[PDB]
Design a protein around this ligand. Structure first.
Ligand SMILES: O=C(Nc1ccc(F)c(-c2ccn3c(N4CCOCC4)cnc3n2)c1)N1CCCC1
Lengths: 239, 202, 204, 229, 228, 214, 206, 218, 238
C-alpha cells in the first residue's frame, strides 16, 4: 500500500501537516465545555438555520457511549470517523472488561488515534479537535479536549474551533469552580456568545449529569439566551 | 487441589491446600495456590499448576498495566473478565485451570470463579479442585453472611482441612487469606496434620 | 444425518405452461417438532419459486445468500433473473463450497413468461443439477415422493389437475415420513397467475 | 518540504528529520534529572496553556514502573507512545524475569521503538529523561529522537536545557542529598521557565535509593521545597 | 534535470543516464585485466590501498563464485560483493537443483540479468561495478564481463578501470591462441605494474587469480612467487 | 515415529545456607541399549552462580540449554554486563517451558544456584514450567526414590529426635553420594557416574563419583 | 440441555423463564445464575449453554446492538433485526475455526412504533434459535431437557390472549413441570417479561 | 531404501568406521554395491543407518555447508566437532518440523591429534564415545567394541581396532538379517579419512552342532 | 546539488553522495583506535570527558561474542543496530557449529548488510563506522567497517574526529606490533588515541575505554578499576 511519509519535521522543528490540521480546526464551528459540581455542559454553534436543512433534529454533539458525549471542531467527515472509532472502542472495552470505559480512558484512546494519524505513513492527520465530557461509573464529572497532534488535556472549561483562544481568555476571567446545572448552562452560552453570532438559533447545547444526558429544547434555551444577552448589555454599559 | 473462597459481611475469605499431585505421586506439599495479583486482588490456582501460574501472572501484568495507564486500580469485574477472555480464547487448547479472582474495588468485595472454558461466575461462595466436593459439605453447612472474621477463617480453614483429610489430591498446608477494604492479609498458614490434632484432640 | 436433522421435504412438478412446487410445514430437531408453520418455499420472482431442504440453519443462510445475489442481479442487470440462470447461479454457489458444503438440497421450479416452457432443477448439496421433464423432489420424504410422483404424474397436465396429484403426492409421502408433514404449502405458477394453497394434512 | 526523503543525510553527516526532531524539543517545556546517591529527582515545567486546564491531566512525569519514572520534553502525544512502550517492556521484564527491569534496559527498550521510522513516517519529537533505581543504584538516562541513550548524572531537556546545563556545571556535585537535588531541580526551573514558579506550575518526582520506589510530589510537597529556598 | 535522477527513465536520445553514471564509477576504479587461454583463464586486478597499515588480502576484489568460477570486481567493491553473493546463489542452485557445475556462459548471463534488473526500477540504482566472470566448467575456459547495464560479453582479453585504454593496447600485443596461463599471470601482472600511476596511488598490490588445468580447474589466487 | 525419546538418568540438588550441591548421573540410555556412560549434557552452567539440570529427552535438554544460554547472553547485553540472578533464570525457565506447551520440551528441569542473600536454592520444574523455590530437588528416572529419602533425611518430619545441626557442604555431598548409590542399585536407567557440582559464592567446585557400571 | 429455558408470547407481553443452574460436572456451583440478558429496553434473550459461550455470545450481541444504536443516533432496532443479527452470528460461527457457540436462545422482544412513520410490527415477538443458527418465530418454545415437557404443557394450556396474571400462573406450571420431571435440579427459574413498558423481572414465579 | 548397521571405534591416532555396502528395500537386498560411508570436507566421514534418502539429503546439505563456507570466506574449514554440531542441529530442526531425518548417523573426524567420533539419532540425540554403533551394531557390535576398550584402557592400536571391528562385522553378518558380507572401513587419521576398498570377512558355518542330524526337529 | 538527496542517485561523475555524507557521520564521531599484535587486538575509544563534576556514559564499545567485539564512531543508534545484528548472527553461528563465527566470515556479513542499505530507496546507509576486533583459528583480526559497505582488514587503524593524527602515530610504529607484548600494544593504542584528543585534555579512566581480545583472552571491556592498570601509569610525551 501507499506508505509515503506525509507528516514530517521541517527545519524549525514544526510538523507542518499537524499545524495545518489545526488550521482546519480554527476554521471549524466553535464548541465549548463547562464542568460544574454535578454537571458537564457541552455547547456548539450550528452553521445557522437554513430553511432547507431537514426540520427533523440532527445533534452536533455526538454520543460515544451512554456516559460519554463529544463535540468536535474541524472536518465533519474526519470527526465522524473518530467518533465511529471512539464508539467502537467504548463497546470493544465493555466486551473485554465488563465495566463501562471511563471518559479519561476513551479520551486517551481518541488522542492516541489522532497521534497515530500524525505518524502513520500514507495518512494526513485528522483535522479535528474534540471536546469529550461525561461521568465515570463512580460519579466524577470529566471534561477533556483532544487536538489534532493527539495531545489531550482535562479542563474546568474549554473551547475549540473558531476564536477558541478568545473564548478561553474570556472564560478563565469569569469561570468559578463550584457551579449549578443552571449556572454552567448560563456560563457555556455566555462563553459561546463571545464569538458566535448574536442569534440564539445557532447555539445547540447538551447538559450531562450522572446517568442523565439532556439537550436543551430551543424553548428552554431562548430563556437562558435572553437572560445572558441582557447580562452582555450590562457588561457593554460598564465599558 | 482444594481451594475455597466466600464473601461475608467482613469481606472475602480465601483458603487453599498446598499439594500438587499427578494423581498418584505427590510432586509437592508446598505449592502456593493463592497468587497475590496486586495488593487488593487474589487469584487461586487449581487444575494445571503451570496453566494457572502462567495465566494468573499474565492477569497480574494486565492489572498492573491497567494501574499505570489509567492511574487507578483495576476492578475485580475487569480483572476476572481479562482472565475469562484468555481462558475463552484458549477454550479448545486443553487448558486445565479453575480459578477464583477475589478482590475489593470501588464497588466493595467481589468474588468470581473463572474456568478453563471461559466461564466467569460471580457468586458469594465457591470451592474449586478435586477436594471441592469435600470442602463444600463443611463450608455450606457452616456458612452464614454474619460470621465474624475469626469464625469465617475458622470455617474456611476447617473446610479446607476436611478436604485435605479425604481428597488424595489435596493436602499439606491450609493457608487462609482475608480480603477487606484495606486489601488482603494472610491470616494463617497451618499444617493440616496439626489441624487434625487441633480439631480432634483425642 | 445432518440433512435429515431439521426435516422437511419439497417437490416441484411440470405441467403444460405451469408448475406446482409444494413444501411440507414441519421444522424439527431430529424427532422433536419445533414448529408446524415453516414452509420451505421462497419466491425469487413471478416466474421462479425454489424450496430448500436440509439443515434449517443452511436453508436460512443459503436462502439469504441467494436473496442477496438475486436482488443484486435485479439492480445490476435491470431485469428478473430467469430459471436457467437462477439454477446455474445456485449450482455455482453450492460448488463454491464443494469441500465444506451447505447442507441444503434446493428444488427450483421456473417458467419462461413468453414461451411457457417449464424448467425444474433439483440440486444435491455440491451443486450437481438434475433437470428432468416431469418432477423433482428433495428432503426426508424424497424416497416416498419419487414413488408417488412417478405413479400420479402425466405429461401435459393443467394447473388444477397438477396441484391435486402434487398435493396427494406430498401428503401421502409425508404420512410415511416422521420428519415431514403438518400439511403442505403448494404454489401453482402459471404465465398468467400464481396461486398459493395451504393444504390440510395430518398433525402427526 | 517533501523534496528530501525522511531517511536522508545532510552533507555534515546528520539525518535531517532527526536534526529537525531535536529542534522540536528546544520548543518544548523544560524538564530535568538530578542523580544523587540518596535517589534521582525528575522536575518539569508543566507550561499549562490556560488557568482552566486541570494541571494533573497534562502530566510531564509518568510512572513507567514502581522504580522508573520518565519525564518528557517536546511533543507530549509522542512521549505517551514511548512511555506506553516502556511500561509494556518493564512489565514484560517482570513477567519473564520476576524482577524490576534495569533503568538502562528500560531506556534501551524505549529507544528500540525510536529507530523504526521510514513503519512510522517520522521520528518522535520527544526527548525522555528516564530516572529509576535498580541494583546499579539510582540512575538517570536521556533518550533522543535518534534512538541514542546517554546516562547522565544531571541533564535538562527542552527550552532552557542550555541555560540549565550552565547552572548544573556550577552547582551539581556527585555527593548531593536528595533534599539538595530537589532544591537545585526547582532553583533551576525557577530561573529557566517563563511563567512564575508555583506549586501547581511544575511537577517534581523522585525515585529514592533507600526504598527503590517512585514518589510524585504533590503541590503541598513542592511548596515544602520552595519554602526551604 | 529530471531526465537522469533514476534508472527507470530513458532520456530523449534513448539512453539511461543513471546506468551511464554507474559506468563512470567503474572507469574511475582500479584497473582490472584478464586473459582466456586454452589452459584456463587468468584475472589480475590492481588494489589501490588508501593506508600503509592494511593486511595482505584486505579488500580482495576477486572471489570464488564456485569451484570452477570466480568474479573479479572492477568498481565499487561492496556493490560487487552483492553480485558475487548472487553469482554464488546461482552457482549453488546449479549444483543443488541441476547437479551440474554452472557453465560460464550461463553464470555470466545470470550475473548480467541480475545487474540489469537494478537498471529497470525507480526504487533501485544500477550496480557501480563491472563483474569479470572467469570460469572453467564443461563449456571450457570462459571470460565474461557484466557491466552496470547488465550487458554481458565474452572476451579473449579484457581491461576495466582508469587504465582500461592503455592496458588494452598491451593486451592486444599478446597472441591468445598461443599463450598459457603461466605466461599470462606474468604478462597481466606486468601490464598492471606498467599502466599504474606511481605519483597518484603510491600504495597498491596486484591480486592475481586463475582457473586452469594447472589448478585442477579450481578458481584460486595464484601463489605470491608467480605474481611479479 | 515419536519425536520424543526418554534418555533416562536422575538429577538431584540440595541447598545449604552458603551453597548448592547439584548432581546428575552420566549414563545416556537409548531404546533398550545404552549410548554413553560419559554424557555430561544433564547439568549445564548458565551463570557462575546458576546451573540447570535437565532429565527426560537429551535432544530437548540440549535445545533448551542453548535457548536459555542465548536468553541469558541477551540479558547480559540489555542489562549492561549484569548476569541474571538464579531467581530471574528460574522465572525465565518457567516462561520458556510454557511458551512451548503445545509441543513441550520432554525435559524435567531444575534450576539450581545461589539466591540474592547467598543462600542456595533449587527450582524443580514440570514439563511446562510449574516450579517453586525449594532447598532440595530431584528429577528423572530415580526421582521417585531419591525425593522421599531427601524428605526423610532433611525435613525429618516423622522423627522425635532433635534436628541435626545444619548439614555442611561435605555432609550434603555425602548424602547425595549415598542417595545416587541407592538409585543406581535399584533404577535400571540411573548409573555409571554422578557429576557433582558444588556451587558456592567463591566458585563451582566439581567432582565425579563412580556408580554401579551395570 | 441441563439448563431449561421457557418462553411464550401473548397479546401484550412475552414471558421468558430460564433455570438458574450453573454446574461443574455434577456440582451445582449455584442455583441462581441469570441466563436472561436484556439486549435493549424492550429485548431480551434466555440463552442456555455453559457460562463461557453464553456470556461471550450474549455480550457480543449486546455490545454490537449498543454500538449500532450509537452509530444510528439512538434508533432502537426491531426484534426481527436483532433475531436475524443473532442467527447470522450463530450461523457464521458453525463454519469458523472457533467452532459453533454451544448456546440455545429464546429471543423475546416488544416492537413499539419507533416514530410517526413506523408501519412495522407492533407488539410482542418471540424467536426460537438453535446453536446452529436456526431462527424460527414461535408463540412459545423451550430449550433444555425440560423443553419437550413444557412445550406439550403449553400446546395444551397456552392461549394467545392470556392476562399477565394467567401467564404467571402458566409460567409457574411450566417451571414446576421441569422440577417434577427433569433429573437435573432446575430448582430456581429467573422469569422476565417484555411489555410495551419494557423488561420487568417477575419474582412471584420461580 | 535403508542402510544397515554402522560401527566405529577410536584407536591410538584415529577412528575406524565400518558399514556393509548394502541398501535394503524392506526385506529385499536391493543394492549390494553402495558406498554408504561418505567423506565430509577434509577431516570427517559420516555413515547412516536408516533412510538412505534422508541420509543423501542431509549428507548433501552438510557437505555443501562445509565447502561453501571454506570457499566463500577465506576461513579455516569446519572442524569435525563443528560439522557434527551442524549435522546435529540440522537433524533436530527436522524433528521439530515433524519432517525427521529418519536415520541414525555415526560421524568420525580428525583435525590434528583431536580425534572425533559421535552418533546422532532421528530425534537429535547426540553422544561422543570411544566406540559408536547404530542399527543392530548398537545391540550386537557395541558390547564387543566396549569390551575391547575396557581390556585396552590405554587405547587400541590400529591393528587391534581393526581386528575387533572385523570380529563385530562377522557377528553383524551372522545375526543382522539385512546385511551382506561386504564392508568398507573409513579410517580417519591425521592425513585425513581414507575409505577401504570393499572387503568380506571369513565366516565359520561348520560347527558339529549345525549338522543336519543334530538340528533336525524329528 | 540535484544528486545528493536519494541513495539511489548516481551523480554524473559516478559518486553516491548519500554514502559520502554517511561517511562524514563516522569522521565527526568520537575517536576510537585499533592495533593488532601477534596474539591480541586492542580497541581504545575516547568517551565524552566529564564537564566539571558532571558525567555522561554512552555505550560505544560492545562485546559481540566471547571472541569478538566492536568500537563504533558516528550514529550510535546505527552502531546498536549492527551490534544487535552481529550478536544475533554470532549466536546463530555458535548455536549451529558450537564455535565462534570466524572473523573473515563476520567481516563479509557486515559488508553485505551495509550494502543492502546503499541500493534500495526505502533504506539509508548506516552512519556508523565499526572497529571489529576478534580472535579465531587464523589468529587476531581487526576490521574497520565503513558506511559504503567496504571492510578493511587492518594491522592498525583509527576512526572518528582528529583520527588522522592517530593514524599518523600508528604509521610510525605499526610495523613493530607483531613483536609487541599485550602491555606494549595497549600503550600504542592509547598513545595513538591521545594524539586524537583536543588541545590540552589527557587520557584517564573517566574519558577512555580499552577493550582487548586474543589467544585465551575472551573480548573484555576495561572501565574504571580494570583500566587503571594501563591508564594511571600512562603519560603522552613527544
Ligand atoms: O473444581 C472445579 N473447577 C475446576 C476447573 C478446572 C480444573 F482444571 C479443575 C481441576 C482439574 C484437575 N484437578 C486435580 N487433579 C485431579 C486428578 O488427579 C490429579 C489432580 C485436582 N484439582 C483439580 N481441579 C477444577 N470446580 C468445582 C466446582 C466449582 C468449580
Amino acid at each position: 500500500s501507499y506508505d509515503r511519509a506525509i507528516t514530517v519535521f521541517s527545519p524549525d522543528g514544526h510538523l507542518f501537516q499537524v499545524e495545518y490540521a489545526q488550521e482546519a480546526v480554527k476554521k471549524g464551528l466553535a464548541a465549548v465545555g463547562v464542568l460544574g459540581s454535578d454537571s458537564v455542559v457541552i455547547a456548539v454553534e450550528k452553521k445557522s438555520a437554513v430553511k432547507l436543512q431537514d426540520s427533523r433534529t440532527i445533534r452536533k454533539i455526538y454520543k460515544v457511549d451512554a456516559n460519554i458525549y463529544l463535540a468536535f471542531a474541524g472536518l465533519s467527515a474526519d470527526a465522524r470517523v473518530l467518533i465511529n472509532k471512539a464508539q467502537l472502542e467504548c463497546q470493544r472495552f465493555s466486551l473485554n472488561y465488563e465495566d463501562t470505559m471511563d471518559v479519561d480512558m476513551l479520551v486517551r484512546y481518541v488522542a492516541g488515534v489522532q497521534q497515530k494519524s500524525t505518524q502513520s505513513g500514507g495518512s494526513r492527520p485528522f483535522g479535528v479537535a474534540t471536546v469529550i465530557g461525561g461521568f465515570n461509573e463512580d460519579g466524577k464529572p470529566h471534561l477533556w479536549k483532544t487536538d489534532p497532534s493527539g495531545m489531550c488535556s482535562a479542563w474546568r472549561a474549554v473551547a475549540i474551533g473558531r476564536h477558541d483562544q478568545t473564548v478561553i481568555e474570556y472564560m478563565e476571567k469569569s469561570y468559578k469552580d463550584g457551579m449549578s446545572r443552571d449556572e454552567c448552562v448560563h456560563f457555556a452560552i455566555k462563553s459561546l456568545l463571545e464569538v458566535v453570532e448574536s442569534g440564539s438559533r445557532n447555539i445547540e447545547l447538551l447538559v450531562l449529569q450522572y446517568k442523565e444526558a439532556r439537550y436543551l429544547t430551543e424553548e428552554e434555551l431562548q430563556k437562558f439566551v435572553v437572560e445572558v444577552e441582557k447580562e452582555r448589555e450590562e457588561e457593554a454599559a460598564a465599558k | 487441589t482444594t481451594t475455597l473462597a466466600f464473601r461475608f459481611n467482613g469481606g472475602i475469605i480465601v483458603a487453599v491446600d498446598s499439594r500438587a499431585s499427578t494423581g498418584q505421586y505427590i510432586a509437592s506439599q508446598t505449592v502456593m495456590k493463592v497468587l497475590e495479583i496486586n495488593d487488593y486482588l487474589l487469584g487461586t490456582l487449581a487444575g494445571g499448576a503451570a496453566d494457572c501460574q502462567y495465566w494468573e501472572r499474565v492477569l497480574g501484568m494486565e492489572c498492573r498495566l491497567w494501574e499505570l495507564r489509567n492511574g487507578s486500580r483495576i476492578t475485580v469485574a475487569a480483572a476476572s473478565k481479562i482472565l475469562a477472555n484468555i481462558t475463552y480464547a484458549y477454550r479448545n487448547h486443553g487448558l486445565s485451570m479453575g480459578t477464583m479472582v477475589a478482590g475489593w474495588d470501588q464497588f466493595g468485595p467481589s468474588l468470581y470463579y473463572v474456568d478453563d472454558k471461559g466461564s466467569r461466575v460471580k457468586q458469594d461462595l465457591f470451592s474449586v479442585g478435586s477436594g471441592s466436593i469435600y470442602a463444600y459439605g463443611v463450608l455450606d453447612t457452616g456458612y452464614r453472611k454474619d460470621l465474624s472474621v475469626e469464625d469465617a477463617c475458622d470455617l474456611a480453614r476447617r473446610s479446607i482441612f476436611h478436604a485435605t483429610y479425604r481428597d488424595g489430591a489435596s493436602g499439606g498446608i491450609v493457608t487462609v487469606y482475608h480480603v477487606h477494604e484495606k486489601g488482603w492479609t494472610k491470616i494463617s498458614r497451618d499444617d493440616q496434620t496439626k489441624l487434625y490434632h487441633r480439631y480432634f484432640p483425642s | 444425518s445432518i440433512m435429515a436433522y431439521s426435516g422437511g421435504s419439497v417437490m416441484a412438478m411440470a405441467g403444460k405452461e405451469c408448475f406446482v412446487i409444494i413444501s411440507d410445514n414441519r421444522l424439527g430437531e431430529q424427532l422433536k417438532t419445533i414448529s408446524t408453520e415453516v414452509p420451505k418455499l421462497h419466491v425469487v420472482n413471478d416466474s421462479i419459486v425454489y424450496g430448500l431442504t436440509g439443515l434449517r440453519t443452511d436453508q436460512q443462510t443459503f436462502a439469504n445468500k441467494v436473496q442477496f445475489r438475486t436482488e443484486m442481479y435485479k439492480l445490476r442487470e435491470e431485469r428478473d433473473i430467469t430459471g436457467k440462470a437462477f439454477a446455474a447461479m445456485i449450482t455455482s454457489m453450492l460448488y463454491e463450497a464443494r469441500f465444506g458444503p451447505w447442507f441444503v438440497e434446493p428444488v427450483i421450479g421456473s417458467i419462461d413468461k413468453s414461451t411457457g416452457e417449464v424448467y425444474l432443477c433439483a440440486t444435491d448439496l455440491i451443486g450437481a443439477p438434475c433437470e428432468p421433464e416431469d418432477y423433482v423432489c428433495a428432503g426426508t420424504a424424497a424416497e416416498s415422493l419419487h414413488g408417488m410422483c412417478e405413479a400420479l404424474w402425466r405429461p401435459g397436465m393443467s394447473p388444477e389437475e397438477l396441484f391435486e396429484i402434487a398435493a396427494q403426492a406430498m401428503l401421502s409421502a409425508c404420512d410415511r415420513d416422521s420428519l415431514s408433514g403438518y400439511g403442505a404449502v403448494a404454489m401453482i405458477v402459471t404465465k398468467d397467475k400464481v396461486t398459493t394453497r395451504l393444504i390440510k394434512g395430518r398433525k402427526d | 518540504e517533501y523534496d528530501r526523503g525522511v531517511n536522508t543525510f545532510s552533507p555534515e553527516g546528520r539525518i535531517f528529520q532527526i536534526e529537525y526532531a531535536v529542534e522540536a524539543i528546544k520548543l518544548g517545556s523544560t524538564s530535568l534529572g538530578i542523580r544523587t546517591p540518596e535517589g534521582v529527582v525528575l522536575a518539569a515545567e508543566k507550561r499549562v496553556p490556560s488557568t482552566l486546564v486541570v494541571p494533573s491531566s497534562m502530566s510531564k512525569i509518568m510512572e513507567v514502573d514502581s522504580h522508573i519514572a520518565a519525564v518528557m520534553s517536546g511533543m507530549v502525544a509522542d512521549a505517551r507512545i514511548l512511555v506506553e512502550h516502556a511500561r509494556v517492556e518493564s512489565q514484560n521484564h517482570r513477567f519473564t524475569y520476576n524482577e524490576p527491569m534495569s533503568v538502562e534496559s528500560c531506556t534501551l527498550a524505549t529507544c528500540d521503538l525510536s529507530i523504526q521510522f521510514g513503519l512510522m513516517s517520522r521520528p518522535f519529537g520527544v526527548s525522555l529523561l528516564i530516572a529509576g533505581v535498580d541494583e546499579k543504584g539510582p540512575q538517570l538516562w536521556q533518550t533522543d529522537p535518534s534512538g541514542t541513550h546517554t546516562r547522565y548524572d544531571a541533564q535538562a531537556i527542552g527550552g532552557g536545557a542550555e541555560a540549565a546545563q550552565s547552572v548544573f556545571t556550577e552547582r551539581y556535585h556527585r555527593n548531593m542529598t536528595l533534599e539538595e537535588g530537589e532544591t537545585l531541580a526547582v532553583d533551576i526551573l525557577k530561573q529557566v521557565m517563563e511563567d512564575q514558579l508555583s506549586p501547581e506550575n511544575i511537577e517534581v518526582a523522585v525515585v529514592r535509593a533507600d526504598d527503590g520506589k517512585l514518589h510524585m510530589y504533590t503541590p503541598t510537597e513542592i511548596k515544602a521545597i520552595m519554602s526551604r529556598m | 534535470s529530471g531526465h537522469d535522477q533514476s534508472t527507470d527513465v530513458f532520456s530523449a536520445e534513448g539512453r539511461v543516464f543513471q546506468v551511464e553514471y554507474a559506468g563512470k564509477a567503474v572507469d574511475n576504479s582500479s584497473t582490472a585485466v584478464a586473459a582466456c587461454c586454452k589452459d584456463g583463464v587468468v584475472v589480475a586486478v590492481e588494489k589501490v590501498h588508501t593506508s600503509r597499515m592494511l593486511e595482505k588480502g584486505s579488500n580482495n576484489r576477486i572471489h570464488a563464485v564456485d569451484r570452477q568460477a570466480g568474479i573479479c570486481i572492477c568498481g565499487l567493491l561492496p556493490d560487487g560483493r552483492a553480485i558475487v553473493s548472487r553469482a554464488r546463489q546461482e552457482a549453488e542452485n546449479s549444483r543443488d537443483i541441476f547437479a551440474t557445475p554452472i557453465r560460464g556462459s550461463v553464470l555470466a548471463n545470470r550475473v548480467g540479468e541480475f545487474m540489469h534488473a537494478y537498471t529497470t526500477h525507480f526504487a533501485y540504482r544500477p550496480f557501480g561495478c563491472s563483474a569479470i566472470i572467469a570460469s572453467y566448467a564443461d563449456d571450457g575456459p570462459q571470460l565474461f564481463v557484466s557491466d552496470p547495464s547488465g550487458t554481458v560479453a565474452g572476451y579473449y582479453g579484457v581491461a576495466l578501470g582508469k587504465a582500461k585504454t592503455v592496458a588494452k593496447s598491451e593486451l592486444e600485443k599478446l597472441d591468445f591462441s598461443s599463450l598459457t596461463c603461466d605466461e599470462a599471470v606474468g604478462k597481466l601482472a606486468s601490464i598492471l605494474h606498467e599502466v599504474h600511476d606511481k605519483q597518484k596511488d603510491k600504495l597498491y598490490e596486484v591480486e592475481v587469480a586463475w582457473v586452469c588445468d594447472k589448478s585442477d580447474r579450481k578458481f584460486v589466487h595464484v601463489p605470491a612467487d608467480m605474481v611479479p | 515415529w515419536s519425536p520424543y525419546q526418554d534418555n533416562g538418568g536422575t538429577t538431584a540438588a540440595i541447598a545449604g545456607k552458603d551453597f548448592v550441591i547439584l548432581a546428575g548421573d552420566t549414563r545416556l540410555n537409548g531404546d533398550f541399549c545404552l549410548h554413553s556412560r560419559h554424557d555430561q549434557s544433564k547439568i549445564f552452567q548458565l551463570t557462575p552462580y546458576t546451573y540447570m539440570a535437565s532429565n527426560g529427552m537429551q535432544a530437548d535438554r540440549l535445545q533448551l540449554q542453548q535457548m536459555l544460554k542465548y536468553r541469558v547472553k541477551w540479558y547480559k547485553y540489555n542489562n549492561g554486563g549484569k548476569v541474571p540472578s538464579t531467581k530471574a533464570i528460574a522465572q525465565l525457565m518457567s516462561t520458556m517451558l510454557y511458551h512451548r506447551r503445545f509441543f513441550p520440551y520432554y525435559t524435567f528441569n531444575m534450576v539450581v544456584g545461589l539466591d540474592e542473600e547467598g543462600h542456595g536454592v533449587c527450582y524443580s520444574y514440570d514439563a511446562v514450567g510449574s516450579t517453586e523455590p525449594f532447598l532440595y530437588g530431584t528429577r528423572g528416572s530415580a526421582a521417585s526414590f531419591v525425593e522421599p529419602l531427601l524428605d526423610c533425611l532433611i525435613n525429618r518430619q516423622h522423627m522425635t529426635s532433635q534436628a541435626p545441626p545444619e548439614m555442611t557442604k561435605e555432609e550434603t555431598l555425602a548424602m547425595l553420594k549415598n542417595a545416587f548409590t541407592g538409585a543406581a542399585e535399584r533404577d535400571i536407567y540411573t548409573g555409571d557416574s554422578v557429576s557433582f557440582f558444588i556451587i558456592t559464592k567463591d566458585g563451582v567446585q566439581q567432582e565425579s563419583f563412580e556408580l554401579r557400571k551395570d | 440441555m441441563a439448563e431449561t429455558a421457557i418462553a411464550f408470547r401473548c397479546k401484550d407481553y412475552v414471558m421468558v423463564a430460564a433455570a438458574g443452574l450453573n454446574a461443574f460436572y455434577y456440582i451445582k456451583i449455584t442455583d441462581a445464575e441469570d441466563k436472561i440478558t436484556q439486549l435493549d429496553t424492550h429485548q431480551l434473550v434466555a440463552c442456555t449453554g455453559e457460562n463461557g459461550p453464553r456470556v461471550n455470545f450474549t455480550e457480543y450481541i449486546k455490545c454490537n446492538l449498543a454500538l449500532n444504536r450509537m452509530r444510528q443516533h439512538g434508533r432502537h432496532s426491531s426484534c426481527e433485526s436483532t433475531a436475524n443479527f443473532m442467527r447470522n452470528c450463530l450461523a457464521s460461527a458453525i463454519r469458523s475455526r472457533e467452532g459453533a457457540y454451544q448456546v440455545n436462545c429464546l429471543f423475546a422482544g416488544y416492537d413499539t412504533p419507533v416514530s410517526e412513520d413506523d408501519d412495522g410490527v407492533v407488539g410482542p415477538q418471540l424467536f426460537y434459535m438453535d446453536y446452529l443458527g436456526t431462527l424460527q418465530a414461535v408463540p412459545y418454545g423451550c430449550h433444555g431437557y425440560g423443553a419437550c415437557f413444557v412445550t406439550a404443557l403449553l400446546d395444551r394450556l397456552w392461549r394467545p390472549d392470556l392476562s399477565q396474571q394467567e401467564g404467571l400462573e402458566l409460567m409457574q406450571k411450566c417451571c414446576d413441570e421441569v422440577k417434577r420431571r427433569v433429573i437435573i435440579s432446575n430448582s430456581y427459574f429467573f422469569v422476565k417479561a417484555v411489555t410495551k413498558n419494557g423488561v420487568e423481572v417477575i419474582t412471584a414465579v420461580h | 531404501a535403508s542402510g544397515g548397521s554402522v560401527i566405529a571405534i577410536k584407536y591410538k591416532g584415529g577412528v575406524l568406521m565400518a558399514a556393509d555396502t548394502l541398501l535394503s528395500y524392506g526385506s529385499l537386498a536391493k543394492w549390494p554395491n553402495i558406498p554408504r560411508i561418505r567423506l565430509l570436507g577434509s577431516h570427517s566421514a559420516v555413515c547412516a543407518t536408516g533412510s538412505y534418502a534422508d541420509f543423501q539429503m542431509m549428507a548433501k546439505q552438510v557437505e555443501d555447508n562445509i565447502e561453501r563456507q571454506k570457499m566463500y570466506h577465506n576461513v579455516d574449514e569446519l572442524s569435525p566437532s563443528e560439522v557434527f554440531s551442524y549435522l546435529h542441529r540440522s537433524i533436530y530442526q527436522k524433528r521439530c518440523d515433524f519432517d525427521p531425518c529418519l536415520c541414525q548417523m555415526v560421524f568420525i573426524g580428525v583435525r590434528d591429534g583431536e580425534t572425533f567420533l559421535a552418533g546422532v539419532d532421528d530425534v537429535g540425540t547426540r553422544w561422543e564415545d570411544d566406540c559408536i554403533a547404530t542399527g543392530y551394531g548398537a545391540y550386537i557390535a557395541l558390547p564387543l567394541l566396549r569390551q575391547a576398550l575396557e581390556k585396552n584402557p590405554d587405547g587400541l592400536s590400529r591393528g587391534e581396532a581393526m581386528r575387533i571391528l572385523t570380529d563385530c562385522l562377522r557377528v553383524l553378518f551372522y545375526r543382522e538379517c539385512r546385511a551382506i558380507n561386504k564392508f568398507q572401513v573409513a579410517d580417519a587419521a591425521s592425513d585425513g579419512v581414507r575409505i577401504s576398498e570393499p572387503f568380506d570377512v571369513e565366516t565359520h558355518w561348520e560347527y558339529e552342532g549345525y549338522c543336519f542330524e543334530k538340528t533336525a526337529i524329528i | 546539488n540535484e544528486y545528493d538527496s536519494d541513495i539511489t542517485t548516481w551523480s554524473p561523475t559516478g559518486r553516491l553522495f548519500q554514502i559520502e555524507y554517511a561517511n562524514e557521520a563516522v569522521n565527526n564521531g568520537s575517536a576510537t583506535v585499533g592495533v593488532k599484535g601477534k596474539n591480541f587486538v586492542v580497541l581504545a575509544a575516547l568517551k565524552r570527558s566529564p564537564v566539571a563534576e558532571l558525567s555522561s556514559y554512552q555505550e560505544k564499545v560492545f562485546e559481540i561474542d566471547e571472541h569478538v567485539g566492536m568500537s563504533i564512531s558516528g550514529l550510535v543508534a546505527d552502531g546498536r543496530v549492527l551490534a544487535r545484528y552481529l550478536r544475533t548472527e554470532c549466536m546463530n553461528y555458535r548455536y549451529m557449529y558450537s564455535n565462534g563465527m570466524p572473523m573473515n566470515q563476520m567481516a563479509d556479513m557486515i559488508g553485505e548488510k551495509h550494502q543492502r542499505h546503499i541500493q534500495c530507496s526505502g533504506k539509508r546507509p548506516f552512519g556508523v563506522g565499526l572497529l571489529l576486533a576478534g580472535y579465531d583459528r587464523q589468529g587476531p583480526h581487526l576490521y574497520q567497517t565503513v558506511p559504503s559497505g567496504d571492510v578493511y582488514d587492518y594491522k592498525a587503524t583509527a576512526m572518528g574526529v582528529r583520527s588522522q593524527a592517530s593514524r599518523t602515530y600508528l604509521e610510525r610504529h605499526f610495523e613493530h606490533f607483531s613483536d609487541c607484548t599485550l602491555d606494549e600494544l595497549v600503550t600504542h593504542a592509547l598513545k595513538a588515541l591521545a594524539s586524537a584528543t583536543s588541545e590540552g585534555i589527557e587520557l584517564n579512566v573517566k574519558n577512555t575505554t580499552i577493550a582487548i581480545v586474543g589467544k585465551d583472552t575472551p573480548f573484555t571491556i576495561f572501565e574504571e578499576e580494570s583500566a587503571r592498570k594501563y591508564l594511571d601509569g600512562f603519560k603522552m610525551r613527544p
